Design an enzyme around this catalytic site. Sequence first.
Site, mmCIF file in Angstrom:
data_model
loop_
_atom_site.group_PDB
_atom_site.id
_atom_site.type_symbol
_atom_site.label_atom_id
_atom_site.label_comp_id
_atom_site.label_asym_id
_atom_site.label_seq_id
_atom_site.Cartn_x
_atom_site.Cartn_y
_atom_site.Cartn_z
ATOM 1 N N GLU A 124 63.091 -31.923 -43.455
ATOM 2 C CA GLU A 124 63.742 -31.632 -42.144
ATOM 3 C C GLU A 124 64.766 -30.695 -42.510
ATOM 4 O OE1 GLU A 124 65.300 -35.067 -40.192
ATOM 5 O OE2 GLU A 124 65.956 -34.108 -38.413
ATOM 6 N N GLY A 265 72.927 -37.634 -46.240
ATOM 7 C CA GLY A 265 72.972 -38.973 -46.894
ATOM 8 C C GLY A 265 71.653 -39.477 -47.139
ATOM 9 N N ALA A 266 70.675 -39.282 -46.261
ATOM 10 C CA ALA A 266 69.334 -39.557 -46.510
ATOM 11 C C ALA A 266 68.520 -39.261 -45.414
ATOM 12 C CB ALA A 266 69.224 -41.487 -46.259
ATOM 13 N N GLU A 268 64.741 -40.052 -43.084
ATOM 14 C CA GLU A 268 63.742 -41.083 -42.812
ATOM 15 C C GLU A 268 62.243 -40.454 -42.968
ATOM 16 O OE1 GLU A 268 65.466 -39.073 -40.804
ATOM 17 O OE2 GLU A 268 64.457 -38.323 -38.816
ATOM 18 N N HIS A 301 70.230 -46.993 -40.357
ATOM 19 C CA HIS A 301 69.774 -45.822 -39.788
ATOM 20 C C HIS A 301 68.515 -45.213 -39.979
ATOM 21 C CE1 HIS A 301 71.367 -41.905 -37.663
ATOM 22 N NE2 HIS A 301 70.233 -41.551 -38.411
ATOM 23 N N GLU A 302 68.275 -44.778 -41.143
ATOM 24 C CA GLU A 302 66.908 -44.401 -41.415
ATOM 25 C C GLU A 302 65.674 -45.212 -41.083
ATOM 26 O OE1 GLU A 302 67.481 -41.247 -41.750
ATOM 27 O OE2 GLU A 302 69.439 -41.582 -42.660
ATOM 28 N N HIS A 305 65.067 -45.122 -37.358
ATOM 29 C CA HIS A 305 64.442 -44.041 -36.896
ATOM 30 C C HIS A 305 62.720 -44.208 -36.903
ATOM 31 C CE1 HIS A 305 66.795 -40.468 -36.410
ATOM 32 N NE2 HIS A 305 67.307 -40.531 -37.714
ATOM 33 N N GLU A 324 68.686 -38.301 -33.224
ATOM 34 C CA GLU A 324 69.942 -38.622 -33.952
ATOM 35 C C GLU A 324 71.005 -39.456 -33.220
ATOM 36 O OE1 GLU A 324 69.857 -38.740 -36.929
ATOM 37 O OE2 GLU A 324 68.204 -37.484 -37.521
HETATM 38 C C1 LIG Z 1 70.749 -29.863 -41.594
HETATM 39 O O1 LIG Z 1 69.426 -30.717 -41.796
HETATM 40 C C2 LIG Z 1 69.393 -31.993 -42.112
HETATM 41 C C3 LIG Z 1 68.123 -32.531 -42.715
HETATM 42 C C4 LIG Z 1 67.973 -33.964 -42.583
HETATM 43 C C5 LIG Z 1 68.842 -34.719 -41.986
HETATM 44 C C6 LIG Z 1 68.553 -36.119 -42.097
HETATM 45 C C7 LIG Z 1 68.672 -36.888 -41.035
HETATM 46 N N1 LIG Z 1 67.481 -37.082 -40.210
HETATM 47 C C8 LIG Z 1 69.214 -38.494 -41.172
HETATM 48 O O2 LIG Z 1 68.647 -39.349 -40.371
HETATM 49 C C9 LIG Z 1 70.693 -38.497 -41.335
HETATM 50 O O3 LIG Z 1 71.272 -37.594 -40.713
HETATM 51 N N2 LIG Z 1 71.326 -39.376 -41.800
HETATM 52 C C10 LIG Z 1 72.665 -39.299 -41.945
HETATM 53 C C11 LIG Z 1 73.394 -40.802 -42.060
HETATM 54 C C12 LIG Z 1 73.360 -41.545 -40.851
HETATM 55 C C13 LIG Z 1 73.933 -42.936 -41.141
HETATM 56 C C14 LIG Z 1 74.428 -40.761 -39.692
HETATM 57 C C15 LIG Z 1 73.054 -38.467 -43.190
HETATM 58 O O4 LIG Z 1 72.211 -37.870 -43.976
HETATM 59 O O5 LIG Z 1 74.348 -38.368 -43.305
HETATM 60 C C16 LIG Z 1 70.054 -34.212 -41.628
HETATM 61 C C17 LIG Z 1 70.325 -32.853 -41.188
HETATM 62 ZN ZN LIG Z 2 69.057 -39.819 -38.482
#
Ligand SMILES: COc1ccc(C[C@@H](N)[C@H](O)C(=O)N[C@@H](CC(C)C)C(=O)O)cc1
Ligand SMILES: [Zn+2]
Length: 889
Positions: A124, A265-266, A268, A301-302, A305, A324
Amino acid sequence: PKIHYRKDYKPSGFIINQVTLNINIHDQETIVRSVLDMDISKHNVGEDLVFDGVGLKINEISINNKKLVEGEEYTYDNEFLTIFSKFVPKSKFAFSSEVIIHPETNYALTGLYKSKNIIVSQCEATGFRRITFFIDRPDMMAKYDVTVTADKEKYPVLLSNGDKVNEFEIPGGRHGARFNDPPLKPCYLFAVVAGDLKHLSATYITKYTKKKVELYVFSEEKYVSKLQWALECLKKSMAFDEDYFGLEYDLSRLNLVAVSDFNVGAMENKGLNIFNANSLLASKKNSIDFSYARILTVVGHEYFHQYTGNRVTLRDWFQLTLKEGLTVHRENLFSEEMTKTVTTRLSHVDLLRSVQFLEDSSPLSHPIRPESYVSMENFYTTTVYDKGSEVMRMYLTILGEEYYKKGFDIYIKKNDGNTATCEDFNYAMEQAYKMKKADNSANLNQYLLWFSQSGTPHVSFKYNYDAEKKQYSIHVNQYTKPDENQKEKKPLFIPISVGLINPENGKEMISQTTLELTKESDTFVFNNIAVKPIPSLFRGFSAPVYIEDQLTDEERILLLKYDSDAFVRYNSCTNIYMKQILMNYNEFLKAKNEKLESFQLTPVNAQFIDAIKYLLEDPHADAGFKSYIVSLPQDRYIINFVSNLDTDVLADTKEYIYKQIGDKLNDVYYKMFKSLEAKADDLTYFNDESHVDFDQMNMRTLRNTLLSLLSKAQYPNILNEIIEHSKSPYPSNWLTSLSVSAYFDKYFELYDKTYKLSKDDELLLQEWLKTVSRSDRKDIYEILKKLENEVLKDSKNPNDIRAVYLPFTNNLRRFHDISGKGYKLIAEVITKTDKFNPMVATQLCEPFKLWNKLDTKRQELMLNEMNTMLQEPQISNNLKEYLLRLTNK
Ligand SMILES: COc1ccc(C[C@@H](N)[C@H](O)C(=O)N[C@@H](CC(C)C)C(=O)O)cc1
Ligand SMILES: [Zn+2]
Ligand SMILES: [Mg+2]
Ligand SMILES: [Mg+2]
Ligand SMILES: [Mg+2]
Ligand SMILES: [Mg+2]
């Protein structure tokens, strides 16, 4: 420079039905062979076949097993592979390729890369095109059959999506695993992992179908003991989705994997969620308290999804908020249920009103569904996530739980399978709105403006009471300031959750009421109101807006003491602080401007101080809530209210107000710091890895907040307390001891002590680094130089670089040093990081977001640094687009 427009969406002229991959990992390169079973769609107009493919080394490409010849039949420019239409079949065909990629040297951490000794993918949003050729957009759904091979001793654990259907030995000490994933998915959800991974596991049996699901959590061997909390979190997340939404996991296995080097952070990926180790691994001995809430949040969160993002897919990247914003909303409902503390909701509001409101008043302001992008990576924002979450939550406020659950199930049933758009979700919610309002003429057409209109609404109030008539009126107005996205702003559908408090006895005067403001202004009248009430407005923070309550400080203090809603009490306290801050700030600024030899400052309202004492001394009040009331609003919340903000004047204003309150309450803060010790630091369950007590962690927050206050105040003999605090087994305590010792000669003694306690755990060392970085030290520049030389060095790990530099950018006095030395330091780090990781370089731009809100000298200094960065010949597309937008160029 290519701009993509939301309104330009068109389905592809091609279809990819099946992907068959062989990923062969070698010492110096990885070879990727892929066969795409393709077709021509109804939308095809005889165009060239163009694949995304970034940084791929081509060994060969074929169509129907006939090798294509470069120059004659295709061209490749390191971004797009173009196969001329005369060479493309007119019916079902196979496209095949073999490319070479290099995960060892992939420091951008997108595509396939090596993090310490683990090979791992991140697709992603546009990372899949860095592994193989593809029409790399989320509406290109396909089935996947993936084989990974590697050295067995180096890479014993092989994982990808779907079922592992074969494992096999290979000559020369290698081995392979085949995974087949029959259900359709977009390519950004593909993942592969290869490593010497250790695991914990459990079995979960689903609520209705009674399916056995195998849960695995993986890390490197050194940290496998830190995996237990994440496993519990995952069980909790599955149970919640079952209990609240009636949704069960569909697959036989779910893997979570922690890696050391991760941009966010992570992620999915279906059945294979991959995490920043800082968002998956914790232990009581080696993690700060925040790690617990963070893991719960990110695992939840993940997991959420799996339905909202994975089973129901996005049509295109402009729909990002649909997965999101909706998934943040789901995780917030989950965490409120799990933690049972008001601080979960307060902490979300505190983030939205500082960080997101700042974005929405900046040159980067956008609606939660933007109209265009150059780099979609730049739209993973607090607006899309956190304002998106509040827009998703307003549906629940409007419908109530029963009808909200009906509408959500309509969304899932109608779209499972299937890409979707924001309108799909609005449509499902509208079906429930019709049912709820008992008429099929009811609609949510106006609600769509929340997806398209940028900027934060301001909502303001006037009141009237007629004692003779027992009739109370609330007149409400809404206003959104014009910006670069809309010259004309329209009124939004704003739900205003309200109560009316009787100020004589603090009781509720009406039932639960949500006012539906749908015009620019409206007057809501209430009959049979026996006394003039104090209104409790936007309970639970019911719409993402600037609230102008027009209440007196006396009214605000009465709500702070007696209201039933945590958010309104917190906001009333916030508003009291803001009136004070703005008044004192003006007084200091006038003194500075007029070069005055003497002047007066307005003191803090004494009845407000009395109210803080009253709440602090209430044994039945919540410790997390108490920690908010003794803290001034965030700097980034305050700046929304001040033009040409002089940061030194704001620092003097905050100092005066903290001293005013401490001069009255320090003895109270001291007594509470002592009396909370037994329960806050209770060790009964320190060796129970699954026992997590959010209230107890909030008691430590309050203790550590009070210690910081007392330490800043130089409360008599407080250094004794600090030194004893450094002996606690809890890192939240002993790291607090380091930061509060900044005000004492013992700082570097505690620096060394806590360094030694931190150095042998990668994540704890990162927490130590943030603690040093945020230390309120006059020699902080020299200290950062020592961190660079002695600890950070040339690390390319995003967690290391972010830990050293970001916390320091919140040092209002020192980061904003009028020489511009702090802005220069951060721009140097940005430009250096941009060479290998454009995404993290853009994250490091965060402090510049408020550049045009500062005093003119600081505006000029920040602008000069951004212009210098823009002038770098080797600047990334990502960084360049971000800085061009931010500087209105
Ligand atoms: C800029 O490119 C990306 C590529 C992939 C993502 C991952 C996205 N889908 C994932 O659910 C996400 O945001 N989790 C958050 C944590 C939650 C708890 C808000 C994180 O990582 O801090 C995002 C951006
Ligand atoms: Zn997300
Ligand atoms: Mg390459
Ligand atoms: Mg259950
Ligand atoms: Mg949260
Ligand atoms: Mg490291």
